Amino acid sequence: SKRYGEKLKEVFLMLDNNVVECIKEITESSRNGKLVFFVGAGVSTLSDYPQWWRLVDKYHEELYGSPKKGNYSSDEYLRIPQIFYNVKGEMAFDGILKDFFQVDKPTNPIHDKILAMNPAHVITTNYDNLIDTACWKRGKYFSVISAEEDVANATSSRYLLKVHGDFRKGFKGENVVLKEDDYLNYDQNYPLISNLMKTIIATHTIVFIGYGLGDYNINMLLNWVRKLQKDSFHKPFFIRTDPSPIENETLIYYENKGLRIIDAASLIDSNEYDYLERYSAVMDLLIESQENKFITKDDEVIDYIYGKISPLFALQYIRKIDLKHVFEYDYHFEVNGTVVRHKNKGFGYMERFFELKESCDERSKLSKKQYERFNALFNFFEKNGVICMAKDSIEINSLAYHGKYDVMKKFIEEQSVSIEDDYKKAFFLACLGRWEESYDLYSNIILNSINGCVYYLSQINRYRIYQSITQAVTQFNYKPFTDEFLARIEREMTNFNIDDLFNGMPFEFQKKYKILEFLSDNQFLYDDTVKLFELTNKVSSDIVVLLRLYDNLRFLYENCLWSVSFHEFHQYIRNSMSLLIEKAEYERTRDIDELGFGFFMEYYDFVNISRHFKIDDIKNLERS
Amino acid sequence: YGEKLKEVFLMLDNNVVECIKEITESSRNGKLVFFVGAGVSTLSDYPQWWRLVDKYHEELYGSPKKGNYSSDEYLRIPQIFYNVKGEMAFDGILKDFFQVDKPTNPIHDKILAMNPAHVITTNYDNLIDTACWKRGKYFSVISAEEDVANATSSRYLLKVHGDFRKGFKGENVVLKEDDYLNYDQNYPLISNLMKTIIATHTIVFIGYGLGDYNINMLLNWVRKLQKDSFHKPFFIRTDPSPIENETLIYYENKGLRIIDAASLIDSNEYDYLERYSAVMDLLIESQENKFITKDDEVIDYIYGKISPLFALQYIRKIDLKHVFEYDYHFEVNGTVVRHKNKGFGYMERFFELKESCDERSKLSKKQYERFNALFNFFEKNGVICMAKDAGTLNTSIEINSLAYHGKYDVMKKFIEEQSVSIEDDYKKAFFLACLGRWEESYDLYSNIILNSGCVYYLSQINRYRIYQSITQAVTQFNGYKPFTDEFLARIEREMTNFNIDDLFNGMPFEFQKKYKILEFLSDNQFLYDDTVKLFELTNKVRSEMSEGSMSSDIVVLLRLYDNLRFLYENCLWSVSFHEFHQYIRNSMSLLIEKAEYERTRFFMEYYDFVNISRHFKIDDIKNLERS
């Protein structure tokens, strides 16, 4: 196991530059969710599924009473079943298919690797259910499309597209593409499936696995690709697992045809019959490239952390709990600024980054561009209060939080020099009650903002301020807002679904700014409200709760989000502060009981209590 | 005008009502794609193509045509001009005729207000682009072949005939006859994408004259498709004269569902904007409408909303407001309150049918059985009637789960018994989890997953939960070898890639619509509202603790019982969570404090004793004794 990992790392370090670039593109596409796997028959044979040549042999035996002397050609594989279908009855064909294919076979680890690569869709020429079984086990639901009618009623947005059909309806030759007749009339009999396959191939990054370079489907797809306009499509990737290394002439010939070939035999040395070894070699190379197990040098951890962090440079402050989602739970980011390795199995890039931060000599060894990127990363991390790993005071910079109303008015009066200044102006106007002007400014920003994170935040804030205006109008019934303005906002906000706002953003934004998705949710503080129960235990929790409250407040104020003014956030602040004070009082009473002679509140605590607590809530706090 | 549209709704034909129903359903599901023709662009006074044909005719022949242009002439005359006068003159005329800025008509905004999944347009103008940019709707605009691969979003604005974004050249658009002849060869990717979108969405045709070249080409392509292997596209016809019955029959048999604007409303034969706005508004204003007029419709709609929940043994009442999209508040005592139901009141009608047998009798047999099933569901879920009609209500609770009562002997007896159906397997897996045999519990849950959509999703969540608890138990023990290291390795291999957050998203949209309330089980959001509730009444009770003044304790107790019944009767492993136990402990502490106050001026029951014995620690009981 460990020897296999060391061998894989050695192979990657000696990998060709072209194969390295192909692996990088495949991993990037998988991260973006644009990856699709075209699964061939080799993956099925890896699970000992009955190969088609066995069926051809059975049909030949039934036709002539003896297996053919020699080897079938490519045309015979489709002709002999056709001859059996014609001269013999269709019932015999279907019965032989049932006798040969109604078997139960386990799913090979290659299916698990393909699924762990996170493909958007899976296109397969296999008529078996092995990939269906693997997807069913792994919990990723795929809309299995194997007939013409399945295309119209597709349940989900991700497809298990069996372009050659399967035996779900039954072990009948009419449901699959086996005979030469089926291949001849495939376009006529499967228009929708072929169109869907071509659309998926055009709109996604295709990786071919389980196919030979001389396969019928591969050549047909290359012929169709030949019809496309030059450079109007992405060249599909082809994983070649044949025992012998691919010839250079064949390699260049097929690369000119549009296939970027990663050849398993060229990467590692394996036995002639060890197909699973080569399949696992390629798939594991891709997976450990995804898992960052091949990052072995500095100025490369810098690139990865920069790719993860640089989109967040637009945002003023990032919650520590958001950094967990930024790195996909690779590290736990404690509120006190300490980082802990949590779930990453590859290189410890955060530890290397902190080592670079601590010692200047190792930092100097980086490249110039990587040195500047590290400088930006260090500024970002120190600004967000990330210091070092576990083994090694709140401050909110927002005029709205401190109630500097005159300064907010002054900032509003000046002329904005950037879109971010307009965003801050709109938030300040919202905090000052000028909600009509806030809505107009947010609409203007939305118009002029198409990273596009300011656009998303402006849409969120505009919906929030529209809800605030609606609730104020409902509770008032004075006319602070003209009826024309109310009608205009109603006509603008009708059928406006905030739930689909994030999904309508570009997928590059949806990958770079996953941590903002919670802003479109109706409720986003359920987690902290739930962990507030630890303060009710009667048997540190208080400091982490207070620091998380400070993190939420700083994120909502520094980034200028109107959701800070809603009832849910006020309720969360009230509950957290009340529970903290009650727990401190309980600790004081327990100590005075056991000893016989707690909470230290600061300016920020006073501001939070003043802004979020009602008079009744403060009365309850004093009474209890 | 709005009341005129309501009158049109009243006089709407049955088939038109059905078509509007499917269109609104597709819009709600996000599978609606709008096919915008040239009439919509013409509504904004955009230069029509016949003006360009006239200009080419004048430029080459020297005089305007005496008669009327035939269909082939619209493509032949520009082709002749391109062949003779060359490409430069063609592009110059195209530029001087098309580089105009035109305001977006309200029809564009009405199309966008339907939230289309995609907008396929034969127009080469940027009017839809401007409308999307103004409304704030982001659409990846695709007008060339290279734009298909470089799409920035999953929602496409597909200009199948191109546009002038690259420039005002004839090569960027499909105008002349040669462009239409070589369209399949010149635009393979765009045509493939259009065909795929049509196949995988609901298409509404707006702006076409039912005789356009594109409409007939799509009909010809549809003809080749397998019978009943596709959904019939909708065609909005906005011609002044009402469509003939024969023509309507001919086109409907060809794979079109035609909504005629001239049939719905009467307008002047030059008032095209009125004709477009009538159908667009009738589609828009039906988004909120549920098309509920008669009692059988009430029964059918409530059955459609409730029947997926028949798989679950019990449903939290507070969750029901999510089922009906916040139309009604379902209070914990069994009372319903009108919250956001703007249309006809189907819950009031259902209760009226329930109380009096006369209206229940005058129902269809299928609808009678549906109403009977709904009555059984609501009676078993504790929903009684509306708030106004509600009288005396008792806090009677029962939990029909062996795990809650701790019938460990019966637990093991049913465990050893052979399972009958997949529900029995699910219950047996929950019993294994409750019995401390998490190994066989995980194996049985994986077997249920393999053999399997409510049970599939519930078993996935339960399997993840027992994997988590196994990890925690192993960490605690090593921080005794209950589990073999081989089992730990296998479960770690199976579960490390699995993510519980996106499990609901990786579910069929039918499941994500029918079983929305189940999504909360993925995270602790399931306990959110109650927790928030559990806090506020606490403070309120504490206020009533000191000033000495339905009951708040009743609401807290009912929410507690609802949570317990939902988590136990549905056989969910979340009953073993620390957060859930803390919630139960806090609720019981508050209830006991209220009881202590009320005594010196409610009683402990069996279920209360079970909850205290299960979810409390010794220190909490000591604190309760002290206070």
Short mmCIF file of all heavy atoms in Angstrom, two decimals, chain A residues 335-356:
data_model
loop_
_atom_site.label_atom_id
_atom_site.label_comp_id
_atom_site.label_asym_id
_atom_site.label_seq_id
_atom_site.Cartn_x
_atom_site.Cartn_y
_atom_site.Cartn_z
N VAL A 335 -11.08 29.60 16.13
CA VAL A 335 -11.38 31.02 16.24
C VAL A 335 -10.20 31.80 16.80
O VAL A 335 -10.04 32.99 16.51
CB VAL A 335 -12.65 31.23 17.08
CG1 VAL A 335 -13.89 30.88 16.27
CG2 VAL A 335 -12.59 30.38 18.34
N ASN A 336 -9.37 31.16 17.62
CA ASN A 336 -8.20 31.83 18.18
C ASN A 336 -7.04 31.94 17.20
O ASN A 336 -5.93 32.27 17.61
CB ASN A 336 -7.74 31.11 19.45
CG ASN A 336 -7.64 29.61 19.27
OD1 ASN A 336 -8.61 28.95 18.91
ND2 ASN A 336 -6.46 29.06 19.52
N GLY A 337 -7.27 31.66 15.92
CA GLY A 337 -6.25 31.81 14.90
C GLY A 337 -5.38 30.60 14.66
O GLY A 337 -4.51 30.66 13.78
N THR A 338 -5.58 29.51 15.39
CA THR A 338 -4.79 28.31 15.23
C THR A 338 -5.41 27.40 14.18
O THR A 338 -6.64 27.35 14.03
CB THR A 338 -4.66 27.55 16.56
OG1 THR A 338 -5.96 27.34 17.12
CG2 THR A 338 -3.81 28.34 17.54
N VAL A 339 -4.56 26.70 13.44
CA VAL A 339 -4.99 25.80 12.38
C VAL A 339 -4.61 24.38 12.75
O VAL A 339 -3.58 24.14 13.39
CB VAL A 339 -4.39 26.20 11.01
CG1 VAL A 339 -5.20 25.60 9.88
CG2 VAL A 339 -4.33 27.71 10.89
N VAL A 340 -5.45 23.43 12.35
CA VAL A 340 -5.25 22.01 12.66
C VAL A 340 -5.48 21.20 11.40
O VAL A 340 -6.45 21.43 10.68
CB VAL A 340 -6.21 21.55 13.78
CG1 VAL A 340 -6.40 20.04 13.74
CG2 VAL A 340 -5.70 21.98 15.14
N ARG A 341 -4.58 20.26 11.11
CA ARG A 341 -4.81 19.33 10.02
C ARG A 341 -6.03 18.47 10.34
O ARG A 341 -6.07 17.79 11.37
CB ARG A 341 -3.59 18.45 9.79
CG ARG A 341 -3.86 17.26 8.88
CD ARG A 341 -2.73 16.24 8.93
NE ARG A 341 -1.59 16.65 8.13
CZ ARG A 341 -1.44 16.38 6.84
NH1 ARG A 341 -2.36 15.70 6.17
NH2 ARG A 341 -0.36 16.81 6.21
N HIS A 342 -7.03 18.50 9.45
CA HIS A 342 -8.31 17.85 9.71
C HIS A 342 -8.57 16.66 8.79
O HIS A 342 -8.78 15.55 9.27
CB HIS A 342 -9.44 18.88 9.59
CG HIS A 342 -10.81 18.28 9.65
ND1 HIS A 342 -11.11 17.17 10.42
CD2 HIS A 342 -11.97 18.62 9.03
CE1 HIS A 342 -12.39 16.87 10.28
NE2 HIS A 342 -12.93 17.73 9.44
N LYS A 343 -8.56 16.87 7.48
CA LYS A 343 -8.96 15.81 6.56
C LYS A 343 -8.08 15.67 5.33
O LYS A 343 -8.33 14.77 4.52
CB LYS A 343 -10.42 16.03 6.11
CG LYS A 343 -11.46 15.44 7.04
CD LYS A 343 -12.87 15.75 6.57
CE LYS A 343 -13.11 15.21 5.17
NZ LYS A 343 -14.55 15.25 4.80
N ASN A 344 -7.07 16.52 5.14
CA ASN A 344 -6.22 16.41 3.97
C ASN A 344 -5.27 15.23 4.12
O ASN A 344 -4.67 15.04 5.19
CB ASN A 344 -5.47 17.72 3.72
CG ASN A 344 -4.15 17.80 4.47
OD1 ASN A 344 -4.11 17.64 5.69
ND2 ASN A 344 -3.08 18.07 3.74
N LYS A 345 -5.16 14.42 3.07
CA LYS A 345 -4.29 13.26 3.08
C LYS A 345 -3.01 13.48 2.29
O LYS A 345 -2.10 12.64 2.36
CB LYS A 345 -5.03 12.03 2.52
CG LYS A 345 -6.51 11.98 2.86
CD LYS A 345 -6.72 11.89 4.37
CE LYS A 345 -8.14 11.44 4.70
NZ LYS A 345 -8.34 11.26 6.16
N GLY A 346 -2.91 14.57 1.54
CA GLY A 346 -1.73 14.88 0.76
C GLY A 346 -0.73 15.71 1.53
O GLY A 346 -0.59 15.59 2.75
N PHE A 347 -0.03 16.57 0.80
CA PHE A 347 0.97 17.43 1.42
C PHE A 347 0.31 18.44 2.35
O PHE A 347 -0.76 18.97 2.06
CB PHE A 347 1.79 18.15 0.36
CG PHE A 347 3.01 18.84 0.90
CD1 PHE A 347 3.96 18.13 1.61
CD2 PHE A 347 3.20 20.19 0.69
CE1 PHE A 347 5.09 18.76 2.11
CE2 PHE A 347 4.32 20.83 1.19
CZ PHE A 347 5.27 20.11 1.90
N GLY A 348 0.97 18.72 3.47
CA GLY A 348 0.49 19.71 4.41
C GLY A 348 0.86 21.12 3.99
O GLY A 348 1.78 21.72 4.54
N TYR A 349 0.14 21.66 3.00
CA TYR A 349 0.51 22.94 2.42
C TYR A 349 0.38 24.09 3.42
O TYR A 349 1.15 25.05 3.35
CB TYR A 349 -0.33 23.22 1.17
CG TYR A 349 -1.81 23.01 1.34
CD1 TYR A 349 -2.64 24.04 1.76
CD2 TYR A 349 -2.39 21.78 1.07
CE1 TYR A 349 -4.00 23.86 1.91
CE2 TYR A 349 -3.75 21.58 1.22
CZ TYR A 349 -4.55 22.63 1.64
OH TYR A 349 -5.90 22.44 1.79
N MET A 350 -0.59 24.02 4.33
CA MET A 350 -0.73 25.09 5.32
C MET A 350 0.45 25.11 6.28
O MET A 350 0.95 26.19 6.64
CB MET A 350 -2.05 24.93 6.09
CG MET A 350 -3.23 25.62 5.44
SD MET A 350 -2.83 27.28 4.86
CE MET A 350 -3.29 28.25 6.29
N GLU A 351 0.92 23.94 6.71
CA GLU A 351 2.10 23.88 7.56
C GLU A 351 3.32 24.43 6.84
O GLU A 351 4.12 25.16 7.43
CB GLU A 351 2.34 22.44 8.02
CG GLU A 351 1.25 21.86 8.90
CD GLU A 351 0.21 21.09 8.11
OE1 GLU A 351 -0.12 21.52 6.98
OE2 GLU A 351 -0.28 20.06 8.62
N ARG A 352 3.48 24.09 5.56
CA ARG A 352 4.60 24.62 4.79
C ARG A 352 4.49 26.13 4.64
O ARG A 352 5.50 26.84 4.70
CB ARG A 352 4.65 23.94 3.42
CG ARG A 352 5.92 24.22 2.64
CD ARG A 352 7.15 23.85 3.45
NE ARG A 352 8.37 24.46 2.93
CZ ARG A 352 9.46 24.69 3.65
NH1 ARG A 352 9.52 24.38 4.93
NH2 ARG A 352 10.51 25.25 3.06
N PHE A 353 3.27 26.64 4.44
CA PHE A 353 3.08 28.08 4.34
C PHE A 353 3.46 28.78 5.64
O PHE A 353 4.09 29.84 5.62
CB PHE A 353 1.62 28.39 3.97
CG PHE A 353 1.23 29.82 4.17
CD1 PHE A 353 1.51 30.77 3.20
CD2 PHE A 353 0.56 30.22 5.31
CE1 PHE A 353 1.14 32.09 3.38
CE2 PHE A 353 0.19 31.54 5.50
CZ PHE A 353 0.49 32.48 4.53
N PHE A 354 3.07 28.21 6.78
CA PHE A 354 3.43 28.81 8.06
C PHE A 354 4.93 28.72 8.32
O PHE A 354 5.52 29.64 8.90
CB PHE A 354 2.64 28.16 9.19
CG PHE A 354 1.20 28.59 9.24
CD1 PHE A 354 0.19 27.67 9.46
CD2 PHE A 354 0.86 29.92 9.06
CE1 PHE A 354 -1.13 28.07 9.50
CE2 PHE A 354 -0.46 30.33 9.10
CZ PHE A 354 -1.45 29.40 9.32
N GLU A 355 5.56 27.63 7.89
CA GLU A 355 7.02 27.53 8.00
C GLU A 355 7.70 28.59 7.15
O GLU A 355 8.70 29.18 7.57
CB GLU A 355 7.48 26.13 7.60
CG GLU A 355 7.15 25.05 8.62
CD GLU A 355 7.27 23.65 8.06
OE1 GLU A 355 7.87 23.49 6.97
OE2 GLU A 355 6.77 22.70 8.70
N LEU A 356 7.18 28.83 5.95
CA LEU A 356 7.70 29.90 5.10
C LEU A 356 7.51 31.26 5.77
O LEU A 356 8.39 32.13 5.70
CB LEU A 356 7.00 29.87 3.74
CG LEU A 356 7.74 29.24 2.57
CD1 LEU A 356 7.91 27.76 2.78
CD2 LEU A 356 6.98 29.51 1.29
#
